[PDB]
Design a protein around this ligand. Structure first.
Ligand code: CA
Ligand code: CA
Ligand code: CA
Ligand code: CL
Ligand code: CL
Ligand code: CL
Ligand code: CL
Ligand code: ZN
Ligand code: ZN
Ligand code: ZN
Ligand code: ZN
Ligand code: ZN
Length: 316
């Protein structure tokens, strides 16, 4: 809509206060005109039709429980936009400052969130497995990163390419979490998963085996469920990414960590310059090695560390 750019204040799903960019026209709308071609957040009103209604509030204060998912979908969309723009010079998910649209209160007791090809969609969870999923910045950024992948490498969502696809989304979801300095960690979904159980998450990048996911190519899942294990085999790449950033010894292989910013640079370059729809794990290693070579030089520590990390997870 058309109106004056304002700054509201609210609380997100976890009760944390934060300012949000709104637009004033009779009501204050969840429309942020400060980023790209706008970040727009919608109320789906427990329906499954999308996007629903552009979110309107009478007083620019968003402290009601019903507001909380909309605050976080809106705010974390902005933060994800800021990360890709400031860190990688990427303008929104399509590189052209496309509008980022998000619908919250999708359906009822819906334990999921997803990029659907044109927008973000967030369930509220059933209160046991999940609380409203926009409360997790890594979930927001994980899903928006699928759009980035779709517009760049086009990785096919099955088998090894699909595991790389998921890992990319876990890597940049986590790097957005760190960049936002929002209680960062190498877990995925910890802020919205199982409110009754503390200290857990959907999966761990630093120790995939904590939740029974492979951390080495020899333990890769070869079944047909989960589209060939895309959410399972991603642990192999996630652990490699963790090792590149933080270092460590894994199955006897010592990795010299090079930090998160370099991890992000190397994998963003691999994603956008080298990966293709059918890239497998070995081709990802080569794309990461070449990316580190482009950025830091063939004799660099960064290149050596990438090779050590893929060695550690058994990917040649
Ligand atoms: Ca209000
Ligand atoms: Ca996390
Ligand atoms: Ca939990
Ligand atoms: Cl570990
Ligand atoms: Cl381990
Ligand atoms: Cl480690
Ligand atoms: Cl180990
Ligand atoms: Zn995903
Ligand atoms: Zn966290
Ligand atoms: Zn998923
Ligand atoms: Zn290990
Ligand atoms: Zn380890």
């Amino acid at each position: 809509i058309t109106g004056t750019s304002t700054v509201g204040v609210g609380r997100g799903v976890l009760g944390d206060q934060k300012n949000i960019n709104t637009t004033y026209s009779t009501y204050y709308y969840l429309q942020d005109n400060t980023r790209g071609n706008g970040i727009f957040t919608y109320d789906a009103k427990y329906r499954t039709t999308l996007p629903g209604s552009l979110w309107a509030d009478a007083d620019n204060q968003f402290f009601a429980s019903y507001d909380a998912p909309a605050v976080d979908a809106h705010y974390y969309a902005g933060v994800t936009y800021d990360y890709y723009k400031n860190v990688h010079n990427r303008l929104s998910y399509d590189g052209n400052n496309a509008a980022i649209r998000s619908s919250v209160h999708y359906s009822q007791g819906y334990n999921n969130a997803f990029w659907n090809g044109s927008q973000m969609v967030y369930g509220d969870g059933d209160g046991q497995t999940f609380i409203p999923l926009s409360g997790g910045i890594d979930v927001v950024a994980h899903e928006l990163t699928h759009a980035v992948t779709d517009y760049t490498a086009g990785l096919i969502y099955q088998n090894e390419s699909g595991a790389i696809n998921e890992a990319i989304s876990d890597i940049f979801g986590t790097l957005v979490e760190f960049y936002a300095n929002k209680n960062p960690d190498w877990e995925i979904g910890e802020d919205v998963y199982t409110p009754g159980i503390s200290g857990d998450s959907l999966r761990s990048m630093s120790d995939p085996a904590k939740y029974g996911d492979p951390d080495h190519y020899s333990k890769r899942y070869t079944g047909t469920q989960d589209n060939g294990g895309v959410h399972i085999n991603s642990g192999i790449i996630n652990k490699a990414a963790y090792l590149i950033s933080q270092g460590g010894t894994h199955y006897g292989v010592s990795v010299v960590g090079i930090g998160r910013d370099k991890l992000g640079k190397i994998f963003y370059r691999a994603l956008t310059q080298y990966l293709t729809p059918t890239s497998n794990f070995s081709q990802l290693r080569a794309a990461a090695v070449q990316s580190a070579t482009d950025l830091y030089g063939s004799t660099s520590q960064e290149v050596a560390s990438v090779k050590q990390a893929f060695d550690a997870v058994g990917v040649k």
